[PDB]
Design a protein around this ligand. Structure first.
Ligand SMILES: CC1=[NH+][C@H]2[C@@H](O1)O[C@H](CO)[C@@H](O)[C@@H]2O
Length: 494
């Protein structure tokens, strides 16, 4: 009978001005896109979302009057923002670019009743609160990571996770496609990596890998949901799958057995063998050809078997290879202490218990111009248990309930780091313990939207007490969408 309030959206929109009567979507509603082919793709995506639960035809049309209009226009919304106007006559989403229209659609779906997400016809009514939202993002780096190395996830399961992150306006998908327990991408020049290095996973199950066509399909689908794919080939540590596949990559020339455990820090590429850099060049060159995004993530975490000076020598030689293939380096924050090249970004995954000296090394790099991606392990690691009783996940970084994950400020977080060095945030989901897509959802939700809100919303909107009510408001939508989630006692679920 009553619309959801115009402000009950995550991320919190930059500006919300409620007023006037709601729009009611009915069988006469059309989706109008004018003559833009870019807007027509967004219109078709919206019609796909709405047709099952409404049962309405919802034709996507160039001309029309009233109804839902998606309009590309010059305006003050940048590359990702939009304005959404709703009243008795219709709803109009205006933006500079298709990504902004797409973000406005993600808001519109949160404004609609939870039953709109159902996959068969529902009664409605389909109300959208009256007023105007004007919305633009705080940070440009708003990313979610999936580890498909520890347990492998199929192309369709990666698409499903893309659809989860698209709900909350993430714009980057970091795929961790190599580790000790699996190598997940076909490399034509090193064909044993995928067939043998991809042949298993944590726990000894059958593993799998993406053919180049599978990977292209993941990239294409991600782009259709306005996610830029950031692939990671972790080096020089976390390389057992590669080392097990090619004896010659090992310092002693002996291939180790495939690894199906969960320990870390034991593996290393051979920093002083020429073949090591031919291998990296070949692999990063093939990956670049599949990567229309700007970045290649070279990892750099837990190289505990690589002495410091060898780690530095290795990264000095590898960073220029990323440049050669026309991309920007991203590494885990161990790179900060190993001469990051100009323009390289580092991903901070430390926690409150990380040494002060280690924090200061990252802060010094930031002060020196190195951009920071924040993903603290005791804040935004979605594989981290909520409490001691969580049946999945890890607790190496302690326990991370919903409020802990949300309630901090990226601009005022790492001591000594300039706020302008912070490019944004990431919510990584590591998979030592997760082996099916429902377990992924149970650990991703309900913290995933909170990290998206950190990336997107203005600092002035940040407030746990009001955010938790917006978060409780998502639960019926997730139930209609088939998403399992942790029902935290911190959140006032209805
Ligand atoms: C960057 C980073 N290195 C470690 C750490 O994060 O924790 C993950 C599990 O939470 C683990 O899988 C990974 O090897």
């Amino acid at each position: 009978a009553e619309p959801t309030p115009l402000d009950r959206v995550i991320p919190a929109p930059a500006s919300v001005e409620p007023g006037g009567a709601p729009y009611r979507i009915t069988r006469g509603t059309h989706i109008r896109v004018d003559d833009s082919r870019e807007a027509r793709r967004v219109g078709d995506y919206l019609a796909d979302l709405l047709r099952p639960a409404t049962g309405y035809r919802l034709p996507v049309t160039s001309h029309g009057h009233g109804g839902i209009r998606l309009r590309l226009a010059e305006g003050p919304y940048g590359d990702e923002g939009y304005r959404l106007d709703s009243g008795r006559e219709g709803v109009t989403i205006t933006a500079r670019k298709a990504a902004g229209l797409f973000h406005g659609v993600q808001t519109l779906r949160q404004l609609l009743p939870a039953a709109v997400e159902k996959d068969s016809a529902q009664p409605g009514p389909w109300l959208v609160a009256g007023g105007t939202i004007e919305d633009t993002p705080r940070y440009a780096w708003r990313s979610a990571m999936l580890d498909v190395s520890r347990h492998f996830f199929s192309v369709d399961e990666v698409k499903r996770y893309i659809d989860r992150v698209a709900l909350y306006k993430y714009n980057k998908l970091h795929l961790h496609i190599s580790d000790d327990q699996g190598w997940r991408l076909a490399i034509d020049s090193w064909p044993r990596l995928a067939t043998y290095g991809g042949s298993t996973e944590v726990g000894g199950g059958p593993g799998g890998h993406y053919t180049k066509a599978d990977y292209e399909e993941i990239v294409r689908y991600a782009a259709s949901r306005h996610l830029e794919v950031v692939p990671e080939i972790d080096m020089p540590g976390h390389t057992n799958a590669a080392l097990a596949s090619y004896a010659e990559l090992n310092c002693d020339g002996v291939a180790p057995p495939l690894y199906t455990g969960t320990k870390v820090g034991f593996s290393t590429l051979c920093v002083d063998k020429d073949v090591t850099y031919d291998f990296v060049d070949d692999v990063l060159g093939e990956l670049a050809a599949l990567t229309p995004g700007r970045y290649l993530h070279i990892g750099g975490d837990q190289a505990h078997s690589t002495p410091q000076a060898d780690f530095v020598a290795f990264m000095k030689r590898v960073q220029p290879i990323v440049a050669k293939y026309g991309k920007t380096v991203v590494g885990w924050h161990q790179l900060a202490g190993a001469e990051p090249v100009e323009g390289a970004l580092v991903q901070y995954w430390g926690l409150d218990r990380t040494s002060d000296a280690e924090k200061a090394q990252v802060a010094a790099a930031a002060r020196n111009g190195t951009g920071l991606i924040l993903s603290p392990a005791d804040r935004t690691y979605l594989d981290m248990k909520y409490t001691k009783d969580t049946p999945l996940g890890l607790s190496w970084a302690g326990y991370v309930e919903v409020r802990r994950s949300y309630d901090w400020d990226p601009a005022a977080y790492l001591p000594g780091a300039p706020a302008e060095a912070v490019r944004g945030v990431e919510a990584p989901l590591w998979t030592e313990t997760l082996s099916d897509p429902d377990q992924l959802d149970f650990m991703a939700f309900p913290r995933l939207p909170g990290v998206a809100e950190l990336g997107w919303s203005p600092a002035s909107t940040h407030d746990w007490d009001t955010y938790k009510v917006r978060l409780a408001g998502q639960a019926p939508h997730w139930e209609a969408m088939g998403i399992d989630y942790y029902r935290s006692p911190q959140v006032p679920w209805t």
